Write a protein that binds this ligand. Structure first.
Ligand SMILES: *Cc1c(COP(=O)(O)O)cnc(C)c1O
Ligand SMILES: *Cc1c(COP(=O)(O)O)cnc(C)c1O
Lengths: 394, 398
């Protein structure tokens, strides 16, 4: 039998041979549109901080008030002694904001997917999953006894063919990202939801990258498509991206929240979030109502950055959200491009196969409300210099 | 079916009516004051023995101030996963402080104890590996294992005779992993690592310890069960534990050999696909580690309180199920009597929650009490007075 170091080496030297081994960088200043990496100031386009909330004094003061009042830790799972007044306050504020009958907060978007898919799905159920769904959705589904089918990315012709072919006396669940993390495209819920109604299916939307981004005042992708009051639409999304904390929520029908409280394994077995995290998120919800112009500025910045990259000759892959991939083609060129950007004071991560297709390696950039014109123009200047040098633009 | 596939409210009702029939429907209490040995439930001050707050850290000013400093310096959110733009100086500060405290070469912090088990078991295990799992392992270990392609065997609880029988019968060219709670979450007994680890060496196996209830509780200064048994430098012993219980925050850690940390950074799915913890959480936990070094007598007081409380429950005629740690179950037998006993304790000013099947065996329903360093003699005696009154009234003690 192998020992631990022997198994570690076999896995690590595999990744190193594969060109898959990661050496993460340590950020040396707060999560902001300008930050410090390897001792140098950089324009940061790598983070999920869409509304510039992650170091906003308003969230930090509401966090500080809840910290001082309630303490450092909840000290139990929600179902034993870890539900406090402040957890209830945040679920009421979220449901109000989402426009859904109910909201439940869980330990992360990652565990929310396990909890909600696990609670909802039984043996004999059929799941129809978009090809390009977030990894956390796959782990949720693997823990269920449901039949798992995959439809080609955003392909409602294929989805329909599968719904047609796979009837059940149980539940049909159509499972999609709201906004896909890599290409920044929006799930076609305008076609998926009606298809759901034809073949009696429930729609499950993991809106990590749509929450605080799409819809009126950032109420999300489901709100954007107008389906937030539909009891047969279930929404899950992280509180770690636009909302700039940690946690994930489940929102929809009244009855869903009671089922999750009683069945969701991460809710039953993992400690509830502490006062400072809940304080910050109550802050984030109050701040986005006080400053709806933040969402405006996120989209203005996004449109400016995509338009200027198109002018230089770059392909941003039809991205529809602040997720702005810049195509470099092959993995090595994307990684070299990222290295050269950092030399220019711009921090944005190269992504290639297996995370994205062969021939579709990109640098992933996420535009935020807190980026200034000078910051975006510095990124553009760097992309111009690096693009010319690597012969992807002229 | 004539009417089609089920709608969401139909599946919810069907599941909730089932749970209500099975006696599995839960209406959690809402706590109206901080996590302390005395808190407020339903408008009334109560002796709280329901929480995991072993060292009384959850509302300690020292953790709150170190959390405050990190919050002010760094902000409300990390805003990315560790592998992209979510590792900050403070995450590495906490990992270095944890490895130093644990006496392991390395430590890595993950989103929870629950997901830590998925990340570490998932990173380590491949198709053709053999896992030997204790019968009474935590739900989070089961979910970690289910996500792996490893062959899964179960040994009768703490039964090193049966474990050896299985090791003898189930060989692999890959990895043998013996997986156990360090401290069992429900019956509060200690994994026999003094016997498991030597057995692991005989059959060339790695030992995996989920020490959620041992971290900050067993060993010198609460360094944990693996430290208590003296195996903290062993590269073939892996530890995972929550930072949510004794350490009174959120998160989980993985500790052991240098190489383990680099494999988790590259392979652990919760690490790759979930946002890192924010400054307030990391601040509080750096604070917790400084406070237990300033006040290691907290562990002594936790154990004095534990021994007192166990002895007095035995005196009344209650069965605490051979519990060894501050986890002090009181056996009621059936789930309904545990639930009723919990209701009657609340009437007496005492908050402790009943637990029955499926989380514990049928006929082994109990109230879980967790004694802490911050419980006073008067609080424990008030709990005992309540257990006496409720016990006599339900005809379980005489
Ligand atoms: C509490 C506990 C966990 C879960 O830890 P969280 O950080 O609350 O997710 C895992 N394993 C065991 C043994 C536990 O007791
Ligand atoms: C980021 C993300 C998650 C994970 O959310 P965490 O709160 O970071 O665990 C899940 N699903 C999708 C689609 C995401 O983009």
């Amino acid at each position: 039998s192998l020992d631990l170091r022997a198994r570690v080496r076999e896995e690590l030297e595999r990744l190193k041979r594969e060109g898959l081994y990661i050496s993460p960088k340590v950020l040396e200043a707060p999560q902001e549109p300008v930050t410090r990496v390897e001792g140098r100031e950089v324009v940061n386009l790598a983070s999920n901080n869409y509304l510039g909330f992650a170091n906003h004094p308003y969230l930090k003061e509401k966090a500080r008030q809840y910290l001082e009042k309630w303490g450092a830790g909840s000290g139990a799972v929600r179902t034993i002694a870890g539900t406090f007044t402040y957890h209830v306050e945040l679920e009421e504020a979220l449901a109000r904001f989402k426009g859904t009958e109910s909201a439940l907060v869980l330990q992360s978007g990652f565990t929310a997917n396990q909890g909600v898919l696990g609670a909802l799905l039984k043996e004999g159920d059929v799941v129809f999953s978009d090809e390009l769904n977030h990894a956390s959705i796959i782990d949720g589904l693997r823990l269920t006894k449901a039949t798992r089918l995959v439809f080609r990315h955003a392909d409602v012709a294929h989805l329909e063919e599968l719904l047609k072919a796979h009837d059940t006396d149980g539940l049909k669940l159509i499972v999609t990202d709201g906004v896909f993390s890599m290409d920044g495209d929006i799930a076609p819920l305008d076609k998926i939801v009606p298809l759901a109604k034809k073949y009696k299916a429930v729609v499950y939307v993991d809106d990590a990258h749509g929450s605080g981004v799409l819809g009126e005042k950032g109420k999300g992708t489901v709100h954007h498509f107008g389906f937030h009051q539909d009891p047969d639409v279930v929404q899950v999304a992280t509180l770690s991206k636009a909302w700039a904390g940690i946690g994930g929520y489940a929102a929809g029908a009244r009855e869903l929240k009671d089922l999750l409280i009683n069945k969701a394994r991460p809710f039953l077995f993992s400690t509830s979030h502490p006062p400072a995290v809940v304080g910050a998120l109550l802050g984030a919800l109050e701040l986005i109502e006080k400053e709806p112009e933040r969402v405006e500025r996120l989209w203005e910045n996004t449109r400016y950055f995509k338009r200027e990259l198109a002018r230089l000759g770059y392909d941003t892959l039809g991205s529809q959200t602040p997720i702005t991939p810049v195509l470099f083609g092959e993995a090595p060129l994307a990684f070299e491009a990222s290295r050269l950007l950092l030399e220019e004071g711009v921090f944005a991560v190269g992504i290639g196969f297996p995370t994205v297709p062969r021939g579709k390696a990109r640098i992933r950039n996420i535009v935020t409300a807190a980026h200034t014109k000078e910051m975006l123009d510095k990124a553009l200047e760097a992309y111009e210099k690096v693009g010319k040098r690597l012969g992807i633009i002229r």
